[PDB]
Design a protein around this ligand. Structure first.
Ligand SMILES: Nc1ncnc2c1ncn2[C@@H]1O[C@H](COP(=O)(O)OP(=O)(O)O)[C@@H](O)[C@H]1O
Ligand SMILES: Nc1ncnc2c1ncn2[C@@H]1O[C@H](COP(=O)(O)OP(=O)(O)O)[C@@H](O)[C@H]1O
Length: 203
């Protein structure tokens, strides 16, 4: 089974993907997480990608497509979390899979209002070591654990990231709808309720 998680930043896609991957045996492919590792490691990808990420812009398609080609799991179930984010990326993904006799099975759209997106991103805190995600209100970190606020989770960059999502990523809703594979998730609900919906639409 191959899944794509689609939706605005802050929708809870990473949180749901981690849970589903651990519980149902999926390889979790997060372009965000992989890019962050590349930036930390100072690879050619990381050095190039950094500028776009810091401004809240998408990293150029060719870089992302190459990345996916390099990490795509041979066999087994896969969650693409936050990829594709553009029509060109989605077209490349479909071509990739076709050559392997595979296809995307379901695309889950994590629907959530802008007001909630902004609350989620502004309260988002991460363990910079482990990548573990918390929220100051909805899932506070333990006192013993060091966390930071991502620089791209500041108001100005959040605004840009949301605009970028609406312009470049939201057209993927119709792209996948017309393939007959889109499923709607009310991503505004609490974590456990969202997870129940996720489990529902893939069974
Ligand atoms: N259903 C939810 N309700 C409230 N907060 C959530 C929910 N899902 C995730 N969060 C919190 O919202 C923020 C965004 O979650 P995340 O999984 O990083 O979203 P995405 O990967 O879509 O950007 C995080 O701080 C996380 O702790
Ligand atoms: N599929 C992709 N295509 C282009 N850029 C990407 C992609 N995935 C991640 N990025 C870049 O990485 C940044 C951070 O992504 P991520 O860690 O997923 O944060 P969020 O969950 O808030 O979107 C994005 O704002 C963008 O610059």
């Amino acid at each position: 089974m191959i899944l794509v998680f689609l939706g605005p930043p802050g929708a809870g896609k990473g949180t749901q993907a981690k849970r589903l991957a651990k519980e149902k045996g999926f390889v979790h492919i997060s372009t965000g997480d992989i890019l962050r590792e590349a930036v930390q490691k100072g690879t050619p990808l990381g050095k190039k990608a950094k500028e776009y990420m810091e401004r809240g812009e998408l990293v150029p398609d060719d870089l992302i497509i190459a990345l996916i080609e390099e990490v795509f799991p041979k066999h087994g179930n896969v969650i693409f979390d936050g990829f594709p984010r553009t029509v060109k990326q989605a077209e490349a993904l479909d071509e990739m899979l076709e050559k392997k006799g595979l296809k995307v099975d379901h695309v889950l759209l994590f629907e959530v209002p802008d007001e909630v997106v902004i609350e989620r991103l502004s309260g988002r805190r991460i363990n910079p070591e482990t990548g573990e995600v918390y929220h100051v209100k909805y899932n506070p970190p333990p006192p013993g654990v060091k966390v930071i606020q991502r620089e791209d989770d500041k108001p100005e960059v959040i605004k840009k990231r949301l605009e970028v999502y609406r312009e470049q990523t939201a057209p993927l809703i119709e792209y996948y709808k017309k393939k007959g594979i889109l499923r709607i998730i009310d991503a505004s609900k609490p974590v456990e309720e969202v997870y129940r919906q996720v489990l529902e639409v893939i069974g």
